[PDB]
Design an enzyme around this catalytic site. Structure first.
Site, PDB file in Angstrom:
ATOM      1  N   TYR A  59      -5.381   1.327  10.492  1.00 38.85           N
ATOM      2  CA  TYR A  59      -4.122   0.618  10.282  1.00 38.85           C
ATOM      3  C   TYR A  59      -2.942   1.409  10.836  1.00 38.85           C
ATOM      4  O   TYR A  59      -2.778   2.595  10.532  1.00 38.85           O
ATOM      5  CB  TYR A  59      -3.947   0.383   8.780  1.00 38.85           C
ATOM      6  CG  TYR A  59      -2.884  -0.597   8.341  1.00 38.85           C
ATOM      7  CD1 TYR A  59      -3.025  -1.961   8.565  1.00 38.85           C
ATOM      8  CD2 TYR A  59      -1.770  -0.160   7.638  1.00 38.85           C
ATOM      9  CE1 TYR A  59      -2.059  -2.862   8.125  1.00 38.85           C
ATOM     10  CE2 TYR A  59      -0.804  -1.048   7.200  1.00 38.85           C
ATOM     11  CZ  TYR A  59      -0.954  -2.392   7.446  1.00 38.85           C
ATOM     12  OH  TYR A  59       0.016  -3.263   7.004  1.00 38.85           O
ATOM     13  N   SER A 132     -11.061   4.600   9.313  1.00 37.95           N
ATOM     14  CA  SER A 132     -10.365   3.945   8.199  1.00 37.95           C
ATOM     15  C   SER A 132     -10.650   2.449   8.253  1.00 37.95           C
ATOM     16  O   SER A 132     -11.823   2.063   8.127  1.00 37.95           O
ATOM     17  CB  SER A 132      -8.894   4.346   8.235  1.00 37.95           C
ATOM     18  OG  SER A 132      -8.310   4.186   6.951  1.00 37.95           O
ATOM     19  N   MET A 133      -9.644   1.585   8.419  1.00 41.04           N
ATOM     20  CA  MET A 133      -9.915   0.156   8.532  1.00 41.04           C
ATOM     21  C   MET A 133     -10.846  -0.144   9.696  1.00 41.04           C
ATOM     22  O   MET A 133     -11.625  -1.102   9.636  1.00 41.04           O
ATOM     23  CB  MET A 133      -8.610  -0.616   8.693  1.00 41.04           C
ATOM     24  CG  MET A 133      -7.904  -0.901   7.389  1.00 41.04           C
ATOM     25  SD  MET A 133      -6.632  -2.147   7.638  1.00 41.04           S
ATOM     26  CE  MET A 133      -5.679  -1.938   6.138  1.00 41.04           C
ATOM     27  N   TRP A 157     -12.447   2.411   5.316  1.00 44.76           N
ATOM     28  CA  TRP A 157     -11.520   1.723   4.420  1.00 44.76           C
ATOM     29  C   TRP A 157     -11.904   0.252   4.391  1.00 44.76           C
ATOM     30  O   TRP A 157     -11.957  -0.392   5.444  1.00 44.76           O
ATOM     31  CB  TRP A 157     -10.077   1.898   4.915  1.00 44.76           C
ATOM     32  CG  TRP A 157      -8.966   1.427   4.003  1.00 44.76           C
ATOM     33  CD1 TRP A 157      -8.096   2.217   3.311  1.00 44.76           C
ATOM     34  CD2 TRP A 157      -8.569   0.071   3.740  1.00 44.76           C
ATOM     35  NE1 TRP A 157      -7.199   1.443   2.615  1.00 44.76           N
ATOM     36  CE2 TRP A 157      -7.469   0.123   2.859  1.00 44.76           C
ATOM     37  CE3 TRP A 157      -9.046  -1.179   4.148  1.00 44.76           C
ATOM     38  CZ2 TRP A 157      -6.835  -1.027   2.384  1.00 44.76           C
ATOM     39  CZ3 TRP A 157      -8.416  -2.320   3.673  1.00 44.76           C
ATOM     40  CH2 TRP A 157      -7.322  -2.234   2.800  1.00 44.76           C
ATOM     41  N   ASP A 178      -9.285  13.183   1.014  1.00 45.07           N
ATOM     42  CA  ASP A 178      -8.693  11.925   1.459  1.00 45.07           C
ATOM     43  C   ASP A 178      -7.976  11.223   0.315  1.00 45.07           C
ATOM     44  O   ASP A 178      -8.585  10.897  -0.707  1.00 45.07           O
ATOM     45  CB  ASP A 178      -9.791  11.020   2.026  1.00 45.07           C
ATOM     46  CG  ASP A 178      -9.254   9.947   2.951  1.00 45.07           C
ATOM     47  OD1 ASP A 178      -8.151   9.416   2.697  1.00 45.07           O
ATOM     48  OD2 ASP A 178      -9.948   9.624   3.937  1.00 45.07           O
ATOM     49  N   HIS A 209      -7.245  12.636   5.425  1.00 42.24           N
ATOM     50  CA  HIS A 209      -7.704  11.341   5.923  1.00 42.24           C
ATOM     51  C   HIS A 209      -7.998  11.351   7.420  1.00 42.24           C
ATOM     52  O   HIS A 209      -8.804  10.543   7.893  1.00 42.24           O
ATOM     53  CB  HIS A 209      -6.657  10.269   5.605  1.00 42.24           C
ATOM     54  CG  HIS A 209      -7.088   8.872   5.936  1.00 42.24           C
ATOM     55  ND1 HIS A 209      -8.280   8.336   5.499  1.00 42.24           N
ATOM     56  CD2 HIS A 209      -6.472   7.894   6.643  1.00 42.24           C
ATOM     57  CE1 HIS A 209      -8.384   7.090   5.929  1.00 42.24           C
ATOM     58  NE2 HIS A 209      -7.301   6.797   6.626  1.00 42.24           N
TER      59      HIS A 209
HETATM   60 CL   LIG Z   1      -6.455   2.133   7.612  1.00 40.95          CL
END
Ligand SMILES: [Cl-]
EC number: 3.1.1.101
Length: 262
Positions: A59, A132-133, A157, A178, A209
């Site tokens: 993101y 992540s995403m 994520w 994280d 992260h």
């Molecule tokens: Cl993200």
């Protein structure tokens, strides 16, 4: 003879170095189809067709956050596409769709005589990675496309933690500290939910992260494991079984788990 085995026999030093044995070239995709932008990294003479890997950022993030994987993996015998999403605010499901679209365009370029990767890809052998995403999107991609041969998301994520249907060999990079995709409520429950597949959990000691992003301080270990996982499962290359499945036994790792790996 394994028809997919490429390159010289691996050593810890060759896997920990900034680049592998193959010479790497790259190009930005002229007309991206189904995603925002892309850079394709490829080896110039791998000795045969090689698998393809699509990597998605998180993101608000762009290619730079995950760019180091491109040259690193390509130098060991993969065609890698790193993408920007249509919007930096896209959700994991949209990221998964764009990840698969990027893989489809690599396959299309493989059949385009004007492309530098013409005839370089085994389009039957593909993998997914992302941060992540984009890591959550990689897991969605694996769940929706079981023909994929490997997945290696980092600090994934997603709103769900139940990926119990995934049969794709999946290596989860996690970062101990994280605070955005916390390990205890995201990465670890995701890992524990998968009972059908070869899987691995590698948590970086004291990592934030972005502990697996470009410029991180553990590129030797993270790069070694990522390449070894992709080689073992995208190429069925048992020369990499130990590197892929072994506990690194390193103080850089705060948690290591694996199952069904060999
Ligand atoms: Cl993200």
């Amino acid at each position: 003879t394994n028809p997919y085995a490429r390159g010289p026999n691996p050593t810890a030093a060759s896997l920990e170095a900034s680049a592998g044995p193959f010479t790497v070239r790259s190009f930005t995709v002229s007309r991206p189809s189904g995603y925002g932008a892309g850079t394709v990294y490829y080896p110039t003479n791998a000795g045969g067709t090689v698998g393809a890997i699509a990597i998605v950022p998180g993101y608000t993030a762009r290619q730079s956050s995950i760019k180091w994987w491109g040259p690193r993996l390509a130098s060991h015998g993969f065609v890698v596409i790193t993408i920007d999403t249509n919007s930096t605010l896209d959700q994991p499901s949209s990221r998964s769709s764009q990840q698969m679209a990027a893989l489809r365009q690599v396959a299309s370029l493989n059949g385009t005589s004007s492309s530098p990767i013409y005839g370089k890809v085994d389009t039957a052998r593909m993998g997914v990675m992302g941060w992540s995403m984009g890591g959550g999107g990689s897991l969605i991609s694996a769940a929706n496309n079981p023909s994929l041969k490997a997945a290696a998301p980092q600090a994934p994520w997603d709103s769900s933690t139940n990926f119990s249907s995934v049969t794709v060999p999946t290596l989860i990079f996690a970062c101990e500290n994280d605070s955005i995709a916390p390990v205890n409520s995201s990465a670890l429950p995701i890992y524990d939910s998968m009972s059908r597949n070869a899987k691995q959990f590698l948590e970086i000691n004291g990592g934030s992260h972005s502990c697996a992003n470009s410029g991180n301080s553990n590129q030797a270990l993270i790069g070694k494991k990522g390449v070894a996982w992709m080689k073992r499962f995208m190429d069925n290359d048992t020369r990499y079984s130990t590197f892929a499945c072994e506990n690194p036994n390193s103080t850089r790792v705060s948690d290591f788990r694996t199952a069904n790996c060999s």
